[model samples]
Target: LNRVIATVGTVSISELDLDDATEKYNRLQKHLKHEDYRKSFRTRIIDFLIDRAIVDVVAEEESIQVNEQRVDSEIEKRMEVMGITNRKQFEKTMETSSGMPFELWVTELPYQIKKGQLLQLKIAVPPPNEQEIRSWYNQNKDKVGFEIRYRIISIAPENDSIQEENRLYKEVSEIRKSILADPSSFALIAGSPRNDPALRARRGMVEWISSFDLYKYSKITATIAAPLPNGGVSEVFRDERKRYCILKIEGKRPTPMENLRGGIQNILYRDKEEDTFHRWLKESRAEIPIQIFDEAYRKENKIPLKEETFHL
Candidate 1:
């Protein structure tokens, strides 16, 4: 009636315990659907279970803590990235993938955290290879590339004639606090709220400004940068030519969703080589040719390259 798969002093890991651990492992992997890899994955899961048993022992001995704050924020972040709008959707997706629900995955996450932390502390691995690092760098560059342009929204007096410098300073600072507190409010306060036409006509739109102007532009350069989805009000500051200013970064942020499918839609940029792009060799005829039978050309004894010579 009793069974044991592993033993450590007074603690014995049982086949029953392993069956539960095996199911936990199954729920975490989303790619368990491919039958081709399922057999290999099943065999590896046994090895992983053994590893987990060993890790649990070390973790208990070391008194490793889960730090629940990390779990809460990290799980929420992952949920956002996966676009799981609600717990119900999250549970259903995991249910389909591994016959277990979202709450089940939460239970598994603490174990995963313990296991990963244990390994990371003990292991020292090399950085990614050149191509992989380059790919990562390129993606990040595209994401945060709003360095060149900025959009201005001034919270200062209408002109320099008014002389209450300190009060103007006080008000600009307060406006910056509120704008930073709720950035979406910049549109609400400095923008056309609801559907009021006259308000928008006054200060409804963006004012694309020059970076060469006297101000620091690099602070939020990446937070909101060019193509579109790229308007970020930068930190508030006091600068010359008077008035409190809170500038913003802005861009058009174009997506690479153009229809370059066939070739005509392509802008056709920097490149070299003839129309012979099927790996190598001539796919099309060339304009330049050498002569074979001309008397003057034969005197020099130079062979000519032509379609007839290669029999293409």
Candidate 2:
């Protein structure tokens, strides 16, 4: 435990550091199922310690420091998050696991909190503008920007016009009304000699074509699937090509971008922040002096030491 496992900057990561982290690991060791599992996770625990050291160095560079009182308060807040109501129990449990008194845990937490605040500051971005969001829309519109992903069961082409079309419309509408009464019966109700055989094979399930994009496909579907009241049936309608079916509003997404806009901006913000931070971590690791002492482990695994091995 006195031996150094690795060194980053002037800081020496000793076996004591690894042992202490192992103890912390054991405190919440419920996830590991086997010796191989523990071995794989052992390096992860070490990497977390190394990453924290890297973050600590950055926090220092940024002159970010957290006070003891603030750490105690933060730990208590985390205590609530952890569902630990008693402070003594929290302290005792922690002490028993890591063999560190309440005071060192108090000392340790502030550094973690400092690193957190520092990263938050580093990775923060302004709200995505309309053009920015719209660009994201253009790039990812198929998956991202949709009010609803809709499906259909079509009753089509009873060839021979006005009187026949009227009879088919009457027939399809009556069936749709019954299906609406019991929406789960769509599969059975869709089963008819009049239904398209290809659609029958799928039990009348349509792919999630976007409601917004549906207009080019069928304005009838766009309008029909728009008012999606959960498990609600669409207003049956006819396309210019004389296709008639009930559009079932299958799924919903959130928005103030009015369905897709808000959700997309939120996702873009998360993507950019994560991209920026990981890039920054990559750069940070480049600048830091790191030396891994476990030569045998590295050679045995055929893994390189300095290729961002310590991930967050």
Candidate 3:
């Protein structure tokens, strides 16, 4: 538990710290309690601890001190939240939840909060502009902002004979002409005994689906390549599945920009912040002398100890 697993400049993180972090993360995520899960997460948990250690190194260099008064206020808020009134209550709660006494737990809280405070001072994410929002909407509208509802009538040939397939396509073409003349005829013709059995059961009614997700359906995307008439029928065509079909666009509606703008802005902000954070972490790590003492971690990351100290 006392083994020095890694170091960031002068800050050494012990194996016990990684173990505790792994346990805490597993508990917080409500992950399955298993050796395999914990083992798989150890490397990532170690990396997370290393990030915090780097923050500590930089915080000290910049003289970034977290105020004890703010920590006290946060502690009071937490105590009230958990119905913890006294030291005993706090200790019991901390022991049950964090597997640590109140004193030990409070000692770690400032550093934990400091990382948050420090990062906020380091990275600044600009709000998305109107053009950026519109660009994002244009690019992802099919997947997120719009839906299409349509009906189709399909004709699948039972035999491998070209003669039989051609006959089915011819029949579908005639059906399309009739449906185009009268839109309501689509359901009637789909319910007819001549239609494909599965689609016939539902009278060819396809419920609302995201426009981008239509590719998951058999050749439905190719069948609708040429825009189908609004509230009218499509020309007969073959899908990727080799089924001849005709489709009708019942309707389509785009979600109001007002409804989706806030979510889009949030996504943009998160993406920018994450990108900036990773870039900052890379630059910070490059300047610092980071060492992994664990042989396996060293080999996996293709890094070796720069200075060796004899230990038994």
Candidate 4:
């Protein structure tokens, strides 16, 4: 008896293979938990599996052979990077945290390498044109328009305590008042109240600025542009997390076209690549035959897995 998880052409994808893939997903999720990007992680994993299946079909058609020695060497490289000397220890660690076995990890390596080779073979590389590069540079000419450098004083709330929050706010407020009275005393007041230890050493100064760049010292670039009409000093502002900030305008520089030409060209190239990849996926998804076992697997796993769901 056998369990089938998926099928590509005449080939069958198994339940064990799905379990292995899920384990890999779980391990990656744990590593990226702090970054808070679960949605992106899941999407990438699904895309990778789809691409792998596609590559497998192509490999079969071409009679491409995977070398065993190369696979073994790749597995050894992974183990060394992860500092795992034996398979038992690796299996135990994965089971405890990732809910996947070590053998599954080793088994998946050769398939990943094969998928990479397929992608490299089919990748569409574009040559840069002079007209495109020049147009990109012209569009981003004033990339550093009205940029201002500032010294920032920040006070971050540790937890959701109203009393503690008020206390820190008061401390930051006093620091702001002192700086307003005598702008030269910015350094003296910053050392005591700034939450960031590294920034405190520099008296809360940010190194550089751009139109879109946010800094710890400044609430927004617009606020530091010119002096207030009412003759009041620049006031402290709160960020999304209730972090208090006070900024003193140090200097401003107007960005030149030549300084930003290369960066603009790179940005344009990336945007073009993204557009191309999306179009490719749209066509590829239409060509692939995908089906799901809505009742059997969904009921057994205590989760819903509907059939005829087209995933990209």
The residue-by-residue lDDT of candidate 2 on 90-170, one tens digit each, is 998777766666765565576558746766787666777888888877777556644555446677765768887888788
* Candidate 2 lDDT: 0.68
lDDT-wise, the better of 2 and 3 is: 3
Model 3 lDDT at residue 198 = 81
Relative to the true structure, how large is the alpha-carbon lDDT of every model? Answer: 0.47, 0.68, 0.73, 0.61
Error of 3 at 64 (Å): 3.3
lDDT, candidate 4, equals 0.61
Per-residue CA lDDT of candidate 4, range 197-309, in tens? 86778766765565345534434634443442322345777655577776677776665546566766677766665556545544655676744442453444345544957
Q: Of models 1 and 4, which has the larger TM-score?
A: 4
lDDT of 3 by residue, 4-123 (tens): 998999899998887667645554444212223434465667776777788788888877776878778878888888777885667677678776556566766766676567667876
Across 1-312, the per-residue lDDT of candidate 1 in tens digits comes to 335544442345565765677766666455433223434543445434544445455567667766668778667777889988786776677667557766666776666677556546643333334454344445554432222444344444555555555666676667667777877765555563321344345553444432322125443333323322355665555434343556555454322222112221121210111111211211111211211222332333343545645545
Better of 3 and 4 by TM-score: 3
Residue pairs with clashing backbones, model 3? none
Could you tell me which residue pairs clash in candidate 2? none
The TM-score measured for candidate 3 stands at 0.47
The local lDDT score (0 to 100) that residue 117 gets in candidate 1 is 66
- Of candidates 4 and 1, the better by lDDT: 4
State in Å the error of residue 188, model 4: 29
If both were scored by lDDT, which would come out higher, candidate 3 or candidate 4? 3
Question: Any runs in candidate 2 off by more than 4 Å, and if so which?
Answer: 23-42, 73-112, 120-132, 135-256, 259-263, 300-312
Q: What TM-scores do the predictions have?
A: 0.33, 0.44, 0.47, 0.38
